[PDB]
Design a protein around this nucleic acid. Structure first.
Lengths: 114, 85, 92, 272, 64
RNA sequence: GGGGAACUUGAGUGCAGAAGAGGAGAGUGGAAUUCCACGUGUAGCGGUGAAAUGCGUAGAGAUGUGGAGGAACACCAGUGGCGAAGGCGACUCUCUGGUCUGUAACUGACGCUGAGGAGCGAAAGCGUGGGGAGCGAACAGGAUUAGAUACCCUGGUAGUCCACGCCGUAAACGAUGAGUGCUAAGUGUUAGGGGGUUUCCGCCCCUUAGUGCUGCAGCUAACGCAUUAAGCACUCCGCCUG
RNA sequence: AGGAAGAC
C-alpha cells in the first residue's frame, strides 16, 4: 500500500477528507466536525488544515506515501489542505478539480431572499 | 422533386412561355393547398402550417376574384376544370 | 444521399464480422436503395465507455435512397444485439 | 372511439359505450366455437362459493391459441372480431397450411397483415418469440410461466409488459402493477400491446347493463344482521364497529396481506 | 483574429475530420468560443454541429 | 366615379442561390440529482447570523462499482438567429410553414386597412388516463420575535412532465397599431450580391434586408425620440374625455 | 451580497 487518492471535499459549511486506495478502498477519514468544531469555524481553512493533518497521520499509519488529490465542491480550504497534505510527510503527484457539473439536470433550489 | 410543378405549368400554360397569368398561379396553389391539407390531416395540431395554409387560401381567393372582374369566361372554364367551390 | 456510420462491438470473429456487414448491406439494398460506396476504418479506441468495450469497429456506408431503407436499417440496427452505434446523415 | 349517449331517459343519462370500429365481422368461425353454460358461483357439490355472480346473457366460447406452436408458417390476419369472454377482442388468422386460428389482436394490427410465430421471426406487432430471442425493452404480452403451457401473464385489454433485460437461463420482465419478475427464457411470449385499449373508459349506465354481464347485486355487511356478517346489526346506520374492517367470513380486509408467507415462487420475484 | 477556413478557402467541415475537430475542441472537452478561436460565425455554427455529432458517435470526449 | 384600350415601378409567379433554437411526430446520447444492492470505512452528516428540528453504531456522510426512473439539455452562446404574437436552444430522421439576395422570363393594379366573424395565445387553473427524479403552494415540526398564520432551517401533498379537450388572462412591454413615401452623418454585428493586380489569403467602394449604439434639422412640457422617428405627410382601424 | 427590529 504505497499510493492513493486523497478525496478532499470543501463545502461552504464543512470540509471532509477521505484517504482512499486507487481501487475504491478507504483507509480513514476526518473533518472539522470530527475534530470538534461545531460553529462557523468548520468553514475556516485552518480547521481544514487540521483535518488534512490527521488524515495524513492515518495515511502514514496504514503506510502509503504518495498521493494524487481530487477536490470537490466550492470552498476555502484548497491551498491549506493541499499544503498540509504535502508538508505532513507525504507526496502529491496530481491535482484534480472534480466538481459535479450538471448540464442542467434538475433545477436548483430556490433563492434565500424571497 | 419539382416535376408536378412543371407539368401543371405547361398544362395550364396559355401563352407560349408564361409563368405568371393567374390560371397558372391558381393551379399551383390548388395543388399546394391540397398537399398541405393532407399534411395537416396527418398532423392535426400543427398550427404555424395552418397559418401558412390560410395565407395561401387568401392569395388564391384574391386572384380568383380579380379573374372574375377581368374575364368571367376564363374564370368559368378554370373553375369547371379545377372543380372547387 | 445518406452517409451512414455504425459501430460494431470488438467481440466478433472476422467471419461473422463480414457476415453481419453483408447482412446489413443486404438490408440497405433489398428496399430498392443501392449503395454508392463503403469504407471500413477498422478498430478504433472510443472516446468513452459504452457497455464493456473501450474500442470498436467503424463502418461507413454511402446510400442513395428513397428514405425507406435508412429507417429500416435504423430499426434493424438498434434492435440488433451486435451493433453498438448508428447514425444516418443526409448530405446537403 | 367512445360513443356517448345523449340523455333521453334517466337510464341513459350517464352511459357510454364502445364504437366497435375495429371489429370487422359479426359471424365467428363454426369450427372454432365451443359451448359454455353459466354456473352462477356454484360448485361440484352445488353450493354457492362465489358471491355476486350468475344470470347474464348467454355466450359461446371461442377456442383461442395461447401456445403459438406453429413455427415456420406465415399467417394472414383475416378478421378482427368481438369475443364476449375477454376484455380484448380477437383476430382470426389463416395460416398458409390452410387452417385457421384465433389469437388475441394486439394494438395496431390491421386486416391482411402477416403473422410469423417462429423463434427466428423478426419483431413486428403480433409475432410470438421466445424470451431469449426477444430483445431488451420491447412491449410484450401473452407471457408463459412454463414452456409450452400457454400464455398467461399479460392477457387483458390494453395491458402490456416490458422486458428489463436478460440474465441467463432467466429473463427479467416488468409486468403490470409495476411488478418485476423472473421468467425462464424458453417461454414463448407474443409481441405488442393488447388491442382494445379502451375497456376502462366505459361508463356502464343502468344497473341492467351491469346485470347483462352476469353481476348480481352486492350488499354491504353494514345492512346485514349480526349472524350474517361481523359488521351487521346496530340501532341504525352503524359504523364499522370492530377494529380491522372484516370480510363476511372471519378475516380482516383492509391491508391484510393474504399471500402465503412460505410460497415457493418467492425466489423468482424481485420487486412488488 | 483570422479564421482558418476563410484563411485556406476550404469548403464545409467534412465532419469525419477527427484531428481537426480535436484541435478546435478544448482539452477538457469544451467547445472553444469564437472570441478565442477566431472563426466566422457561420463556420462556428457548422463546427459546433460537427462537434456534437462526433460527441454522440464517441469520436471526441465529453469530459476528461 | 362608370366603361374601353395601352404601360411596369406597387403586388405576385418562374429561375438561380443563402441562412435559421420556425412547427408537428418518431428515435437516439452524455453529465448530474434521487432511490436500491454490494465492497471499503468510522462517528458524525446536514444546516444558519448563532442555532435547533431532522438522518445516522439497525453503520450515516465520503468512497468504488452495477441497475431503476423522471426532468432538463453545461461550454457552443453572441445587446446573435427564427417566428404575426405567445415563444423556440442536446443530436438524427419523415412531413411542413415562411423570410432574404440576384434576375428581368412572365400576368399587368391582382393593392392597403379591417367593425362584427374565425384561429392561435406565457404561467396558473379544470376534466379523463398515465408518469412522478428534482423543485415545491397547501400542511407539519425547529428557530427568531412582544406576537410571526412570514422571511430562515428540515420534511412534504396538489402541481410542474406526456396525450386529449377546456378557460382565454399578464407589466401579453418598445408601457410606442398596420401600410407606403421623403428628411444630415459616424460606427459595430447577421445573411447575401457587384467592381478594383487573384480561382491565393485580405483591403477598399457601392448595395440591400434585419439587428444595435451615438448623434443634426425637426418634434416634445421635460426626460427623451431622431432613416428600426415620438420628424414631415396620406389611408384605414382601436381607444380617452377629472 | 456582509443580523429580526414597531408606533408618534
Amino acid at each position: 500500500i504505497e499510493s492513493g487518492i486523497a478525496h478532499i471535499r470543501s463545502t461552504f459549511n464543512n470540509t471532509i477528507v477521505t484517504i482512499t486506495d486507487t481501487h475504491g478502498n478507504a483507509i480513514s477519514w476526518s473533518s472539522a466536525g470530527a475534530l470538534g468544531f461545531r460553529g462557523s469555524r468548520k468553514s475556516t481553512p485552518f480547521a481544514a488544515q487540521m483535518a488534512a493533518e490527521t488524515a495524513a497521520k492515518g495515511s502514514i499509519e496504514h503506510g502509503l506515501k504518495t498521493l494524487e488529490v481530487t477536490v470537490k465542491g466550492p470552498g476555502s480550504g484548497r491551498e491549506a489542505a493541499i499544503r498540509a497534505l504535502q508538508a505532513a510527510g507525504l507526496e502529491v503527484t496530481a491535482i484534480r478539480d472534480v466538481t459535479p457539473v450538471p448540464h442542467n439536470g434538475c433545477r436548483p433550489p430556490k433563492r434565500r431572499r424571497v | 422533386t419539382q416535376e408536378r410543378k412543371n407539368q401543371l405549368i405547361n398544362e395550364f400554360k396559355t401563352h407560349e412561355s408564361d409563368t405568371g397569368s393567374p390560371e397558372v398561379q391558381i393551379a399551383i396553389l390548388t395543388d399546394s393547398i391540397n398537399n398541405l391539407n393532407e399534411h395537416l390531416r396527418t398532423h392535426k395540431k400543427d398550427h404555424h402550417s395552418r397559418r401558412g395554409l390560410l395565407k395561401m387560401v387568401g392569395k388564391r381567393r384574391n386572384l380568383l376574384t380579380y379573374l372574375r372582374n377581368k374575364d368571367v369566361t376564363r374564370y368559368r372554364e378554370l373553375i369547371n376544370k379545377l372543380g372547387l367551390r | 444521399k445518406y452517409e451512414v456510420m455504425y459501430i460494431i462491438r470488438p467481440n466478433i470473429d472476422e467471419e461473422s464480422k463480414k457476415a453481419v456487414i453483408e447482412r446489413f448491406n443486404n438490408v440497405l439494398t433489398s428496399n430498392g436503395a443501392e449503395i454508392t460506396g463503403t469504407k471500413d476504418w477498422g478498430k478504433r479506441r472510443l472516446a468513452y465507455e459504452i457497455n464493456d468495450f473501450r474500442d470498436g469497429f467503424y463502418q461507413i456506408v454511402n446510400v442513395q435512397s428513397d428514405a425507406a431503407a435508412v429507417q429500416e436499417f435504423d430499426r434493424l440496427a438498434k434492435i440488433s444485439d451486435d451493433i453498438i452505434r448508428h447514425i444516418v446523415v443526409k448530405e446537403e | 372511439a367512445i360513443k356517448k349517449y345523449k340523455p333521453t331517459s334517466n337510464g341513459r343519462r350517464g352511459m357510454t359505450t364502445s364504437d366497435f370500429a375495429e371489429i370487422t365481422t359479426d359471424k365467428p368461425e363454426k369450427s372454432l366455437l365451443a359451448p359454455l353454460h353459466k354456473k352462477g358461483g356454484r360448485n361440484n357439490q352445488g353450493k354457492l362459493t362465489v358471491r355476486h355472480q350468475g344470470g347474464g346473457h348467454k355466450r359461446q366460447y371461442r377456442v383461442i391459441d395461447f401456445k403459438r406452436d406453429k413455427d415456420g408458417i406465415p399467417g394472414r390476419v383475416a378478421t378482427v372480431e368481438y369475443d364476449p369472454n375477454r376484455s380484448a377482442n380477437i383476430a382470426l388468422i389463416n395460416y398458409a397450411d390452410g387452417e385457421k386460428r384465433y389469437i388475441l389482436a394486439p394494438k395496431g394490427i390491421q386486416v391482411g397483415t402477416e403473422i410469423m410465430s417462429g423463434p427466428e421471426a423478426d419483431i413486428k406487432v403480433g409475432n410470438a418469440l421466445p424470451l431469449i430471442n426477444i430483445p431488451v425493452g420491447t412491449v410484450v404480452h401473452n407471457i408463459e410461466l412454463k414452456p409450452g403451457k400457454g400464455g398467461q401473464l399479460v392477457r387483458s385489454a390494453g395491458t402490456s409488459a416490458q422486458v428489463l433485460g436478460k440474465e441467463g437461463k432467466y429473463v427479467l420482465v416488468r409486468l403490470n402493477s409495476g411488478e418485476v419478475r423472473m421468467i425462464l427464457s424458453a417461454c414463448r411470449a407474443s409481441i405488442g400491446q393488447v388491442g382494445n385499449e379502451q375497456h376502462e373508459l366505459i361508463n356502464i349506465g343502468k344497473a341492467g347493463r351491469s346485470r347483462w354481464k352476469g353481476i348480481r347485486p352486492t350488499v354491504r355487511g353494514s345492512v346485514m344482521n349480526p349472524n350474517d356478517h361481523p359488521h351487521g346489526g346496530g340501532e341504525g346506520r352503524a359504523p364499522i364497529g370492530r377494529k380491522s374492517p372484516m370480510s363476511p367470513w372471519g378475516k380482516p380486509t383492509l391491508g391484510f396481506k393474504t399471500r402465503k408467507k412460505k410460497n415457493k415462487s418467492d425466489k423468482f420475484i424481485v420487486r412488488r | 483574429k483570422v479564421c482558418y477556413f476563410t484563411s485556406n478557402g476550404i469548403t464545409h467541415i467534412d465532419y469525419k475530420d477527427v484531428d481537426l475537430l480535436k484541435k478546435f475542441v478544448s482539452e477538457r472537452g469544451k467547445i472553444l468560443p469564437r472570441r478565442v478561436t477566431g472563426t466566422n460565425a457561420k463556420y462556428q455554427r457548422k463546427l459546433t454541429a460537427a462537434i456534437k455529432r462526433a460527441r454522440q458517435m464517441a469520436l471526441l470526449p465529453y469530459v476528461s
